[PDB]
Amino acid sequence: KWTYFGPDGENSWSKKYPSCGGLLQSPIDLHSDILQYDASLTPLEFQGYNLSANKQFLLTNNGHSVKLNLPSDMHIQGLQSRYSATQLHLHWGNPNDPHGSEHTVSGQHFAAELHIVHYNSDLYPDASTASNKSEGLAVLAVLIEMGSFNPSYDKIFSHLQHVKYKGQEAFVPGFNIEELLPERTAEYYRYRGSLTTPPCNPTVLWTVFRNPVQISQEQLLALETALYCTHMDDPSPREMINNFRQVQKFDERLVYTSFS
Amino acid sequence: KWTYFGPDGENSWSKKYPSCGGLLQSPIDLHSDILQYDASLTPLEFQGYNLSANKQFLLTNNGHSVKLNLPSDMHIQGLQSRYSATQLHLHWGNPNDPHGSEHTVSGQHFAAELHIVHYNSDLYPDASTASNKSEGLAVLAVLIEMGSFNPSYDKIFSHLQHVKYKGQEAFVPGFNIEELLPERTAEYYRYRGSLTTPPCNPTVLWTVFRNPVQISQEQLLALETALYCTHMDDPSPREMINNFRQVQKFDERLVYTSFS
Ligand SMILES: COc1c(F)c(S(N)(=O)=O)c(F)c(NC2CCCCCCC2)c1S(=O)(=O)CCCO
Ligand SMILES: COc1c(F)c(S(N)(=O)=O)c(F)c(NC2CCCCCCC2)c1S(=O)(=O)CCCO
Ligand SMILES: [Zn+2]
Ligand SMILES: [Zn+2]
C-alpha cells in the first residue's frame, strides 16, 4: 500500500501513516550547519556479529527492500541500553542514477546504504513491541560507494537471484556481519530520528558511520537489477529501484559527531 | 492550512491538495546524471521587463512568501507560446542554516531563490485559469548566493519592513526586472515540473538559470528576519523562514541544458 514511485509514493505516505508527516523524520542531509561535536559519545562495540556458519538466516524480498533476519544474540554495546539485532536491509538508486543512499553528506548521495536494525532489548521483548515505543530502535547506517569488489557484501548479493519477487525467501548461512562495517567505526554522526519507511515511527536512534565502504561497479549494478517490488503473478511488474526516501527538513535541531 | 513546518508541512500537503502527491513535482536536484545538452534551447527574450518608474507595483506578504504583482505586458518570447508575467516571489532559509533555495545544484543549496511566474496568455485569459491547464505556466528561477550587495534586489528588499505581517501591502516603483537576472541568461536548465506550493499543479515549464546572483549578508539577513507568516496582532508570532520545498524524486526523466 506504499511505494517510492508514483501515486502511492512518499508524498502520500502521510495519508495512511500519519507519523510520516510528523516529528523527528529521517533521513537527513548531514551538513556543517546542523552538526555539533559531542566529546561524550563513545565507540560502539559489536558483539555476536560473527554469526555461526552452521546456522542459517532468512533473506526476504518484502516488496520494498531485501532484508536479512538477524538473531537477538547479536547486540551493540555503547548506548544507554543494550540493543539487540533484528534485521539488516539496503537502499539503492538505479543504473542511470546510481546514487541511492538515504542520508547525504554535505548534499551528496552515496551509491547505496546498508541499515542494521536493532531494538532495545532491556526495555522490550521483541522488535515489533519496541518499534513504536520510546527509545525502541537503533539503526546503524553504512554508506556505500563504488570502488573495489567487496567479498563480504557478496555474501548477501550472491543470493539475490533466489528472492527476485515480493514474498520470496531464501536462507543464507551465518557470516561475520562486522565485515560489512567501515574503517574507524568510532567516527560517526548520531541523531534522533525515525523509520525511513511507513509507519515512520519517531523511535530510531541513528548512527551513521563517517567513512563509507566500497563495492565494485559490477556489484552495484547487480543489486540495482536483481529485484522486483511485485509478486510473481502481478500483471504490472515493477523493478526494485530508487528505494530510498528523500531527505527531510531538519530545523532547530542537531546531529552530534564523535569526531571534531 | 499549509505550512513548511510541523503537522501541516510538506509531507502532509497531499492530504489537502491531490496534485502535491502526483506526477511532475518540483523542485529537483540538478546533477550530472540527469542532464542532457539540447542545442535547440535558444535564449529567451525578456519583453516589457523595464517597468515604468512612474508606476507603482503591489508587494504583498501572503503568509507564505513576499510577492510582487507584475503586469501582463511583461512577457517571455522564445517558447512555443507567449507567456505573460503575473508575479514574482522568493524562497529562503534561516540565519542558523542560510541555505534555502528550492532547486539544488549537485546537491548544494544556494542561499535563496527568486521565481518570476508567467502564464500562457496565448492559450488562457489569465493566470488562475491557466494554472491547472496544459502548458499553463512558465517560471523563471534565479539562484541567489550570499556575497556582494545587490542594488537591484534592494529595490524590493528596501520595502520589507512595511510588509512584515500577513496581508500587509506596500508599493514598489517600477524598475527593470531584467536587473534581477544573472549573467549569461542564455545558459539555463529546462524541465517540465510543477508549482512548488499547493496546489502543486504539474503545469510549469521551469527555466533555472545556470549562474547565481549575489546579495549581501545584510540583505540575506533582512529577507530571513523581516517577515512573519501571521497577522500583525497574533500574540504568538510565526516567523517566515525555511519557505522552500525539499527536492522531489526525478526518475526516468531528464533536465535539458543550453550549455555542455
Ligand atoms: C526496508 O524497510 C525498512 C526500513 F527502511 C527501515 S529503516 N530504514 O531502518 O528505518 C526499518 F527499520 C525496517 N524495519 C524495522 C524493524 C524493526 C521493528 C519492526 C517494524 C519494522 C521496522 C524496514 S522493513 O524492511 O522491516 C519494512 C517495514 C515496513 O513497515
Ligand atoms: C509563494 O507561493 C507561490 C509559489 F511558490 C509559486 S512557484 N514556486 O513558482 O511554483 C507560485 F507560482 C505562486 N503563484 C502562482 C500564480 C499563478 C497561478 C495561480 C495559482 C498560484 C500559482 C505562489 S503564490 O505566492 O501565488 C501562493 C500560491 C498559493 O497557492
Ligand atoms: Zn533502511
Ligand atoms: Zn516559488
Author numbering:
A (entry chain D), B (entry chain A): 4 to 263
The authors write:
Four ligands in complexes with CAXII are of similar structures, contain a cyclooctylamine group at the 3-position and (3-hydroxypropyl)­sulfonyl tail at the 4-position, but vary in substituents at the 5-position: compound 9 has a (4-hydroxybutyl)­amino moiety, compound 10 - piperidinyl, compound 13 - methoxy, and compound 14 - ethoxy. The introduction of methoxy (compound 13) and ethoxy (compound 14) groups at the 5-position of fluorinated benzenesulfonamide 5c resulted in the most strongly binding compounds for CAIX, with the K d,obs reaching 4.5 pM at pH 7.0. Interestingly, cancer-related CAXII also interacts strongly with 13 and 14, exhibiting 0.05 nM and 0.11 nM binding affinities, respectively. The tight binding of 13 to CAIX was confirmed by the ITC experiment, the slope of the integrated binding curve at pH 7.0 was extremely steep not allowing accurate determination of K d, however at pH 10 we obtained quite reasonable ITC binding isotherm with K d,obs around 26 nM. First, the meta cyclooctylamino group is positioned in a hydrophobic region of the active site, making the main contacts with A129-S130 (main chain), V119, S133, and side chains of L197 and L139. The hydroxyl tail is oriented against the backbone of P200–P201, forming a hydrogen bond with the main chain oxygen of P200 in most subunits.
The role of carbonic anhydrase isozyme IX (CAIX) in tumor cell survival, proliferation, migration, pH regulation, and cell-signaling pathways made this enzyme a promising therapeutic target in oncology. , Tumor cells primarily express two membrane-associated carbonic anhydrases, CAIX and CAXII. These isozymes belong to a family of zinc metalloenzymes that catalyze the reversible hydration of CO2 to form HCO3 – and H+. Although the active site is characterized by conserved amino acids between 12 isozymes, the amino acids further away from the zinc ion provide some variability. Crystal structures of CAIX and CAXII with five compounds by using soaking or cocrystallization were determined to confirm the binding mode of the ligands and reveal insights that govern enhanced affinity.
